[PDB]
Structure formats: C-alpha cells, structure tokens
Amino acid sequence: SMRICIFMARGLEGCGVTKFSLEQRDWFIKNGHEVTLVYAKDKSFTRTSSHDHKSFSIPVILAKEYDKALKLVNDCDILIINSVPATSVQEATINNYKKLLDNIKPSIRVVVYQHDHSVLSLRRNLGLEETVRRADVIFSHSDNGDFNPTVYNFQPPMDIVKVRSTYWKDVSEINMNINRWIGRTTTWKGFYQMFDFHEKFLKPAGKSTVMEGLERSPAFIAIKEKGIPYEYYGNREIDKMNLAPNQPAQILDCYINSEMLERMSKSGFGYQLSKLNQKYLQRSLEYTHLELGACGTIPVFWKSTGENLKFRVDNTPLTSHDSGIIWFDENDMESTFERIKELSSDRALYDREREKAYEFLYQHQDSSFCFKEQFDIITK
DNA sequence: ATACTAAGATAG
Numbered sequence A: 001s002m003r004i005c006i007f008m009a010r011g012l013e014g015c016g017v018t019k020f021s022l023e024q025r026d027w028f029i030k031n032g033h034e035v036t037l038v039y040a041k042d043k044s045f046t047r048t049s050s051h052d053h054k055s056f057s058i059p060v061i062l063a064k065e066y067d068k069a070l071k072l073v074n075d076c077d078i079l080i081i082n083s084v085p086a087t088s089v090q091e092a093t094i095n096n097y098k099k100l101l102d103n104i105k106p107s108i109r110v111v112v113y114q115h116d117h118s119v120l121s122l123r124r125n126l127g128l129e130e131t132v133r134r135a136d137v138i139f140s141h142s143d144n145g146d147f148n149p150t151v152y153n154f155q156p157p158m159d160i161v162k163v164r165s166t167y168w169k170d171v172s173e174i175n176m177n178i179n180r181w182i183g184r185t186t187t188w189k190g191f192y193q194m195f196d197f198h199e200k201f202l203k204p205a206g207k208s209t210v211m212e213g214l215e216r217s218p219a220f221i222a223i224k225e226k227g228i229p230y231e232y233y234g235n236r237e238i239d240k241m242n243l244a245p246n247q248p249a250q251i252l253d254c255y256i257n258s259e260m261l262e263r264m265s266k267s268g269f270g271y272q273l274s275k276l277n278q279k280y281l282q283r284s285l286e287y288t289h290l291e292l293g294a295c296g297t298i299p300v301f302w303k304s305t306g307e308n309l310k311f312r313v314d315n316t317p318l319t320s321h322d323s324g325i326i327w328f329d330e331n332d333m334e335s336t337f338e339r340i341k342e343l344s345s346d347r348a349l350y351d352r353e354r355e356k357a358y359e360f361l362y363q364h365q366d367s368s369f370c371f372k373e374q375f376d377i378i379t380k
Numbered sequence B: 001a002t003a004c005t006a007a008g009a010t011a012g
C-alpha cells in the first residue's frame, strides 16, 4: 500500500485531464491505496461541475498558499502531476509552482503525465521544463510526436465495467430516433460534420439530433456567422428540448457527465467524431469515446481515427476488427446512414452490436488493464 | 482562406 498525491497544477478544467484524474483516483483506491486529489485554484474554469469531485478534491492557491501546497505535495509516496499552470496565470503562481518542484522530497517518486497531444500545446504550459527535470517517470500519448528521462506511452483509462452496470439500459428502452453527439466547441471534435449529417440525412428521415457540450466560447461565433440552424438549451432548460421530427439540431452546453450518461444510454446513436493528426496518434482514445461503448449505445466514431489508432492487444488498426463500431466517413455519409437505419429496425442486431463494441472498448482502455500497465512502469 | 481557441463583462 502507498499514499498517492494527484496534482493538477493548472486547475480543474472539467474535461479529460480532470476525468483521467478521477479515474486514476478510483483505481488506486480500488487497489487499496491512499489518494489525495489536489488542484491549483488559481485559475478558474467552466466545467468545474461536470464531474463529481467537490466532496474530496483539495484546492490551493499557489500564488498565496505556497506552504499549504508544499505540505500537500510532500505528504505522499508518489506524486502524479497531470497538468501545469497555464500561460494566463500571474508570476506568483507559475513562480511558486516552480518552487514546489525544487522542494519535493528527494524520496517521493514524481510521475508526470503529458496529457496534451498537440504541438499547439506545450506552448500553453509553463514550468513544463522544470517539471520534466524533476520527474522520475514521464508518460505521453505518442512517441512520434511534438513532445519528443525515458518517455513511456499510456492511454487515459476508464472503468468501463462500472459505467455499464450503472447506465446500460434494455434495448426496448433505447429510442432509435435520437442521435446524440458529445464533445466541445473545437473543430477537430467534428461538430460541423455533425451539423451537416443531420441536415443531409438525420433531419430528412424525421430523425432527431442532439449535440451536448458546445459551450458558447469564441469558437461558437463561427457557427453563427455561417447561419447554421440550431436551438440552444442550458442544463436547466433541458426539458424544453424539442425532440420532435424534422427539427434543427438541439444544442446543450456544458453538461453534467452523469446526467449525460443517462440521456445517452437511452439513445439510439452516439457520435464521437474527433479527427486528430496521426503524429500524436498511437493507442489513446478519448473519454467520450469510451463513454459511448459503455453506456450501451452504438458508437459512431470518425473513420480516419480508427485507421490511425492501434488496438492495445495486437497493435493493429481499430478499424480492422469487428467492434460493431460504425465508422463515420465524410466521403460516404450515405453508406454510414445505411448501417444506422439498418440496426435501427432490427433491435435484435443493434443489441448484438452494442455488445461487440463494449467488449472491444473494454479490452482497449479499461482501467483494469491500463492503470495496471502504468503502475508496473511507475514502480518498475 | 483554414484550423484551432472560453475573451471578458456582469448578474447572482
């Protein structure tokens, strides 16, 4: 047994790094370990309430509570750092952050996970080079990437088993006329391809489309400037949502993760159209990818992403397996629509497919396999 | 152009 301190020096953004952090805590605890979740409250974000953490996470203001922070990160056997201060923070914050790195007990094994898989990243990171100099172990999403002592690979795991046994519904309860897209307002999440698809196929067939997570950040202005039809709702107005036929895309903003899993488990189809560049592509799928195969719905993933990510077991393209995963192709959206109405009539098939994906995604990124993988390297 | 990005003010 050991004490682990998970540190998010950037703050709790409420996305994959926060998620990863929560799933990381769950696993250590599940394997009999003490975990303290600490985050720097200097900077504030929006999706702060998207994941449940308030009752156990420990905030700290680096620019003003250095000693509190020092006491915190030095009270453990293993320090895992998942994020670092952003470029928009004050000198005192980044500076005091760097001062923490220099005063971490020589005995504490410092493990650093580089969660950003974009060249654009690392630029929005401060004190990154000092974190790397003190790290005892480093993990990244890809070897053939921008980032590149010894850098190991990892996948952001999730307890897919748990999610199923909580939300997985009975086919007879899944409305085949609802298409749900989840992600956020950045172009590579594929929100345009989703708006198109609805306008060209989904809407016509009196089907419905929902898109959760599109925050009205500056990026949202492009959607407006292009005059794309949509009806906007907040989490408290999710009741006014019009799930009728031939309607425009219903857009929900920053959503609660638990609630989303519920609405999804009762949805004929779930869309995750992220299209990341193969440089930073190896084996890592994204949380929203694994949340679809787990809640019990047919997963529509971006075709070229599957063609670029390797399966954890054999190291081969994900698209070269019978996952029951519908690979969305921007250059053949009608064929993709085929495999959809198809499974949307023979609910018997739909259910023999959603079972195939869950097993596939389970074998690929469940915490049971991945964290054990990462734990062996940390303690190697 | 194209791809990626919560910037910033205010009410509660």
Ligand SMILES: O=c1ccn([C@@H]2O[C@H](COP(=O)(O)OP(=O)(O)O)[C@@H](O)[C@H]2O)c(=O)[nH]1
Pocket: A014, A015, A016, A017, A019, A047, A050, A051, A183, A184, A212, A213, A253, A254, A255, A256, A257, A258, A285, A286, A287, A288, A289, A291
């Ligand atoms: O408004 C939102 C948007 C996303 N998420 C969750 O936050 C995580 C985001 O991680 P992912 O790897 O899917 O993408 P990222 O946002 O980190 O690029 C996923 O578990 C989503 O279900 C959420 O709870 N609310």
